[PDB]
Structure formats: C-alpha cells, structure tokens
Write a protein that binds this ligand. Structure first.
Ligand code: FAD
Ligand code: FAD
Ligand code: IND
Ligand code: IND
Lengths: 446, 445
C-alpha cells in the first residue's frame, strides 16, 4: 504494498512520517511513504523566507512568519511528548524562544527519526483525484527541479498543507487612493521597514498583537489598533492607540466609527486566513471557517465522505505540535487497520456531538480545555505517549493572565516543563531589548 | 453542438469573443462560447487593483500594473482595426494614454459587441484535460462566488491567460538580512511610497525603464539600475545611475560587481516572468522563455500536439492588441473549419522556419518588423480588416528615435493613426508634470 501520499512537510506532515517510522521502529510493517513539499526545505510556517506573494517557482509563498518572531506562547505548551527541551539542548532555556531556536528543536526530532528520505522537496501538488473503480487516489504534482508534471497512484492521502497561508483580505472604502502600503499579516516580514512610521493594524487575531508588538520594539512612531470583534483591553504603551473599526481611508488618512481620523503610513490587515485547497475537487475538499471543530472530520482527521482521505491540523490551534502528533498517530493506526472505523452515520453523530459542545464554548479557559479534551481522546486510542494536558491548560491560563497584566513583558516570564518539571530560567536579555533574532545570541551569555 | 472554452478575459480573451461575435454579425452560425475569468471584471492586466500577492479569493494577483502607468508605446501601434480611437472617444486624444483610458477603450469594443454574457467571472480555471475516447476537453473551474468546483466539456479550448503575471524572482546574497523593502515588478503599485527614497532597480526589461521613471517622476531621491545585458544607451537624470550586476546586500547597503557599494531603501526586481500554467499537464503545457517565436505553436497559435488547443498572445509583445485580434480571428476560422490544418509533420517545419528566422534577428526594427510580418501572415488568411503594417512599423521606429532622444519626454510625442489618419494632438500637460492618473483629468482641458 500500500502507498500513502503525504501533502506538505510542515510540523503536521513531519508528525505523520514520524508516526509511521516510530511504528516501524517497534517492529511493524509499514506502507510505502511519499511526502510532497513545495519548498526546498521542511518546516512549513517555520521555514522563514524573505519572499512574499509568490515564490521562485511561482507558487504562493507559504510562510507567514516574520523576522524577530518569538514563541507565541510558552515553549512548555508545545513541548513534544517523545522529545524534550532538556533532551535537545542539554541546558534549561527561557520560556519563549525565537523562531530559529524552535525550528532547530523541531528539526532535531525529525532528523533523529530519519524521515527526510521519504520527502520529495520542491514538488508542488496540483491535483488529488479519487477513482471509484480503482478505489485509489491519483496525485498529480509539479516537480520544479526538472519542471515536469507527473502523477502517481496511492491508496491513502494525508493532507497537511495548513490553513494559515491563504489570506482573507477584505477591502475597505478608498483603498484604491491610499498612498501608503497595504499588506496582510501574511505579507509582513520586517518591523524595520516601519521604523519611524505610523501603522494601522486592522483585525483582532493573535498576530495583530504580535506584529504590532514587533513594530513597537523596532522603532515605529505610532501603532493604532481597530476591530469590530470584542476589544481585548490590554496595557498598551504610550504611542499605541486603540480605536473602533475602520470605515474609510483616503490618500493618507484613516477614518473610524467614532468619527475620528488620523494620518497613517501603512495599513496591516490582520484579518485571518481561509481554508484553501486548489488541488482538490468538492468530493475531497474541506470547506470551513477557522474554529476548534470543523465538520465532516471524524475524530477531527477522517474525511467522512471518503474515509481513505485524512486531514491533519485543520482545527484552530490553541495547542499545536502535540495535537498534530496525536492526529498523525491516530490516522496512522486507521490506515494500518489497528483502529476500525464506524459507519458513516455513526461518524457523523460523533462529529455532531463535538460540534454541539464547541458551540457552548465562551471563555478562553473552556476553549483550550475542549482542545485538551480532544487531544486526550486521540491519545487514549494509540501507543502515543500521554502527557499532562490539564497542567498544560493551566500554563496556558497563566500565560493569558500575564498578557492581561502587561502585553509587553509576558515573554520575559517563565514556566515549568510538564515533561520534566524543570523550571525554565529567566532569559539573559529582556524581550524589549533583545533585538538580535538569532539562535547563537539566544544560546549564550551576552 | 460545438462548445468553446476561452480561458481569461484580458485583451486576448476579449479579442477571441469579439472575433466570434464578428462572424455572427455577418450572418454565420457560431459555436457555443464560455469564457472563464478569475477577476471580478475584464481587461486583464489593464484592470487595476491595489492588491498584491494573493487576491480576495486567495488566487494569485494577476495584474502587474501600477498607478500612473501610461501606454508604453504609441496607441496608434495598438489600435483596433475594427474599432478605432475616433469611434470610441468621439474625438482626437494624445498618443500615450493612462492605463484607465486604454482600459475604457478595450472594454468599449466588447461592450458594443455585447460579449459580456459569455463570461463567468470570479471563476478560476483549475485544470484542463483532453479525453481520448471523447475527443473533447474536460475543463474544471472553481467558482468563488458559489464556492463550488465543477467541470464542463468543450470541443476546443483557447488559452488567453497571459505570460506577464507569474514572476521570475531570483535571490541575492544577504536578502534574508536586508532591512528594506524587496518586491518584484509584479508587486509595484505606487511610486509615492518611494518619495525621498533610494531605490534599486534590478534587471533589464521594459518595466524596469518605466517603473524607475515613475519613481523619478513622483520624487525618489536616487535611482540605481543594475543589469547583465547590453547597455540601453538612454540619457538618465542626474539622480539616476547605472551599475553592473548586483552581487550582495547587507542590512542597509547594496554591493555591485565592480566593487562599488551604495545605501538602498528598496530593491525592486524587474527580472521578468515565466510562462506558468498550473491548470495544464505536460501534454498541453506551453514551455518557453519570453520570445517572439516559441516552438510547438503552428502559426504561433495552434498547439501542435493537440490542434484543438490554442494559445493567444503568448509571444513577446511589440505589437499587442491588434496582434491578439489577428491570432483570435485566425484561431476562430480554424475552429469554424474555414481554414484546414496541414499534417503535424508539415506544421513542425513551418514553425522551425519562423524559428530559424527568429534567430537571425538583431535590431529592434528587425524584431517588431518580424512581428509585423507575422501579423500580416495571419490577417491575410482571415476577414480581419487589413491595416497598414509597414506604416505601423515606421511608427515604432519613430517612437524608438523619440526614446533615444530623451527617455523622459517620449510620451509627449504624437503620431498619425494608421486606421483613420487622425493626427494625435499634443497633450494638455507634458508627462513629467502630468501627475494625475485619471481618465477624467486626461480627457478634459
Ligand atoms: C504567524 C504565525 C505564527 C505562529 N506562531 C506559533 C507559535 O509561536 N507556536 C506554535 O506552536 N505555533 C505557531 N503557529 C501555528 C502554526 O500553524 C504551527 O506552528 C504549524 O506550523 C502548523 O503546521 P502544519 O504542518 O499543519 O501547517 P504549516 O506549518 O503551514 O505547513 C504546511 C506545509 O504544507 C506545504 N504545502 C502547502 N501547499 C502545498 C502544495 N500544494 N504542495 C506541496 N506542499 C504544500 C507547505 O509548504 C508547508 O510546508 C504560528 C502560525 C503562524 C501563521
Ligand atoms: C506592467 C505591464 C505594463 C504593460 N504595458 C503595456 C502597454 O503600455 N502597452 C501594451 O501594448 N502592452 C502593455 N503590456 C503588455 C500586456 O501583455 C498587454 O497589454 C495585454 O494586457 C496582454 O493581454 P492578454 O489578454 O494576452 O493577457 P492579460 O492582460 O494578462 O490577461 C490575462 C487574463 O487571464 C486571466 N487568467 C489568468 N489565469 C486564469 C485562470 N487560472 N482562470 C481564469 N482566468 C485567468 C487573468 O485574470 C486576466 O484577465 C504591459 C504588461 C505589463 C505586465
Ligand atoms: C494564526 C496566527 C498566529 C498564530 N500563532 C499561533 C497560532 C496562530 C494562528
Ligand atoms: C512586460 C512589461 C512591460 C511591457 N510593455 C509592453 C509589453 C510589456 C511586457
């Protein structure tokens, strides 16, 4: 024999391969593995590129990640269950490591497992089609090294292409006339471009705060945040304004709902992403807004309309890397026959339950607990090692309390590994002054 | 019973529709037409949007066009033989009109034609595939208005998706560490953004020349061109430099081959585009660098491996809009069976002859005169109205002399139309001071 196509080699696609290898390393017969990645290296979001818009082959630039990015939450909340920070580094480090430091930690585990062989890099997925007679999928790809398009036959397909890469970009009145830059969070790369400039941040996602925060750090003159969705109510610095939603812009001025206006040099639209799958027709294609429980996914992973097709990591992400492992392990066992699937209507009833519960959620605390609960459910069914989920939630809660205390100093705080119990030290340099992005400057004493 | 798929509603797609409508107006029965267009409106490149990268539906932003873009060549060189400037504006207008004015003009023709009803907008072509058993093409699209993906069958397909939209974006050493803006020409929109800024223009194409001019016109402090090809031999302003090829950048500075160094605010890569067709497999896919004569295109339009698949406007462009018409009218008459196709073996040899001629071309005048000759060959076969192609060539030569004279005032020149003989009036404002982009400003006094 059986062949499995794996779509993308970010954390999810890496988790999937790692799952099969781990089973194989325990003495199990695994199917043939082929993983298509469109970039030249693995990492998905984590593989930083200066590029924006379209890449060197004309494929949409995937990564939304920017210079000076640090761990969004505590590292202790993403720590792998089968690979620790103590293992990888040998020395206890601070709670929010920068992009390069985390990437290296993600690379350590995946290189150790030796799954790089299975990946065909620089190869973009064009189309995935199911053949009712064959009961197998056809996968058409464009290899950019030889500039040829070829297709192979597989028994199962696992889609790990993400859903934070194809921006939702709304239009406001008069954008046509605006004299400054307009970009989505997805295009944002470098805070230095906005040095001594006034930036308007539109929308209220997690990135809105952090992109805004990076701009403040690197010498922005003014930041203005506006959104219609419920105000977050933080402790913003002296030069950071919070306004009601945007109605209009003109050549150099932004207009808001209260009737007020201001001069702005650049507009950043932190307005989210869409679930986009150009390689799939409607029979296989997941359509959903970003949320904790999308429909048509049995156990959050199995495409109900075709059980031999799988999605990894398509849920909104409070948890990340631990969720993808739990999912990949489950999917793995489903492919292998270790876990039988229920009837279609039974899968749907199960899904309906998960949704009915998702609709009840109001607080931040209910939401991670719910995702915690989901991951727990997946882990109970496989040989994947369990981990302290309630304590991981508690750490999440503590991190959200620090954000509300002070939005500029939350990255200086420290947390305890739930893998080892070792308390992370305080970093040598406070966040606001730690201008050097690098791993080398992170792993040392200056 | 015969059904045609037209991919794209830029000038080419507009031309293709118009060519069929023109046959119908004459009395002929025409096949069923369906046009797919991923944008919300027609005009292709000429449809301006503030957006860059990906569009509202997450499709790649197609238009490479920027604010304050005016016609690159004489409008007389791009006039429709069947729909003149005199007929559309009802009056004489200058020779180098702003994008909006030209866009209003190309929409004019198709509005009059009434061909809008064949187009399905906000629809992106996903895949085109030919069926051996059926001898038909299966065309799969994504309708972004309905969020549905569907397919329909067509007997012929005409690809008009363009080839100046998917960027060739080379990387340079230090790009990852450079503290300023790096964009491709494809993303350039507003030259005001670069006011009082030092801008590096990398590469040598026709937009390099213009993009730099817009940045100069709108108040850049300094501009640097760097390229690998032969000297352009243009007289640039005092704040405009020429350097050899870029080698590396650091955080603030750019470095060149000769050992020179310069502080730059923004790097705009005017490095070109690739023929990119994600919706086709290798059986149908056109593979080629940007040139006047690509292979596997009989009469430059008929795809030699599958004669029922056509390509419009896929050559490099000296002539533009009336070349598309000529291709479109030819491709129309082939579809309707007015023009029979020779052996696959005989098609190859005709294409290799045009190709061997292509390789002997050195001068600019040899390059457009080649293309003039190619159009002449096309229009001789169809009822597309004859027009003075040698006199068009002479207008290109004039334009070229005007560029060589002063690169910053060539747009102030005037030309006789080769359709109506109308002498284009000198514009109310010289280009360098004509800061207002709009049609309304361009048409007033
Ligand atoms: C701005 C930002 C900041 C973030 N910060 C954090 C953080 O601090 N901590 C945390 O835990 N998580 C963070 N995340 C969440 C992030 O989604 C996960 O960390 C993780 O990257 C998700 O992995 P994934 O494999 O599911 O998708 P992705 O990381 O997006 O990777 C998907 C992969 O699929 C590939 N692909 C897509 N389309 C194709 C195609 N057609 N053909 C071939 N390959 C394709 C891509 O190249 C990519 O490698 C952040 C996300 C964003 C957008
Ligand atoms: C920056 C720039 C400036 C230029 N200036 C001039 C000038 O001054 N004078 C001149 O004569 N020429 C100019 N050109 C040349 C230009 O190629 C022509 O003017 C003309 O626009 C080409 O027409 P076209 O229809 O063949 O391609 P396009 O104008 O690019 O039209 C292609 C159409 O196909 C659509 N499309 C693409 N893919 C899909 C898909 N997947 N599904 C559905 N629809 C799709 C696009 O949305 C678009 O509408 C310029 C080109 C550029 C890039
Ligand atoms: C979207 C944007 C930023 C993010 N950080 C962590 C998850 C995530 C999702
Ligand atoms: C690419 C860029 C600019 C251009 N002007 C005329 C043709 C053309 C092609």
């Amino acid at each position: 024999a059986t062949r499995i196509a794996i779509l993308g080699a970010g954390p999810s696609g890496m988790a999937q391969l790692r799952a099969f290898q781990s089973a194989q390393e325990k003495g199990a017969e695994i199917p043939e593995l082929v993983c298509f990645e469109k970039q030249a290296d693995w990492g998905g979001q984590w593989n930083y590129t200066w590029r924006t818009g379209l890449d060197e082959n004309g494929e949409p630039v995937h990564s939304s990640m920017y210079r000076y990015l640090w761990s969004n939450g505590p590292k202790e909340c993403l720590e792998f269950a089968d690979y620790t920070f103590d293992e990888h580094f040998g020395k206890p480090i601070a709670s929010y490591p920068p992009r390069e430091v985390l990437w290296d930690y993600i690379k350590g585990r995946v290189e150790k497992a030796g799954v790089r062989k299975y990946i065909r890099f620089n190869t973009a997925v064009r189309h995935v089609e199911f053949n009712e007679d064959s009961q197998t999928f056809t996968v058409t790809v464009q290899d950019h090294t030889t500039d040829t398009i070829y297709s192979e036959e597989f028994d199962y397909v696992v889609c790990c292409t993400g859903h934070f890469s194809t921006p939702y970009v709304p239009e406001f009145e008069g954008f046509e006339k605006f004299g400054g830059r307009i970009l989505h969070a997805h295009d944002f790369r470098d805070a230095l471009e906005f040095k001594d400039k006034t930036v308007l941040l539109v929308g209220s996602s997690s990135s809105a705060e952090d992109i805004g925060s990076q701009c403040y750090k690197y010498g922005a003159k003014k930041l203005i945040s506006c959104y219609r969705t419920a105000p977050m109510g933080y402790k913003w610095p002296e030069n950071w304004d919070e306004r009601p939603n945007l109605v209009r812009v003109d050549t150099e001025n932004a207009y808001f709902a209260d009737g007020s206006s201001e001069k702005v040099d650049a507009i950043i639209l932190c307005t989210g992403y869409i679930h986009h799958f150009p390689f799939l027709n409607d029979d296989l294609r997941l359509v959903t807004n970003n949320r904790l429980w999308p429909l048509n996914l049995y156990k959050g992973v199995v495409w109900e309309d075709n059980p031999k097709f799988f999605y990894i990591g398509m849920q909104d992400q409070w948890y990340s890397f631990n969720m993808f492992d739990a999912q990949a392990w489950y999917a793995r066992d489903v492919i292998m026959g270790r876990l039988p699937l229920p009837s279609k209507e039974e899968m749907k009833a199960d899904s309906m339950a998960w949704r009915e519960k998702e609709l009840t959620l109001v607080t931040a605390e209910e939401m991670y607990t719910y995702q915690g609960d989901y991951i727990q459910n997946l882990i109970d069914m496989t040989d994947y090692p369990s981990f302290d989920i309630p304590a991981t939630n508690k750490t999440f809660l503590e991190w959200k309390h620090h954000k509300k205390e002070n939005i500029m100093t939350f990255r200086d705080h420290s947390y305890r590994s739930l893998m080892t119990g070792t308390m992370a030290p305080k970093h040598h340099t406070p966040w606001i002054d730690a201008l050097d992005d690098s791993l080398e400057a992170y792993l040392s004493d200056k």
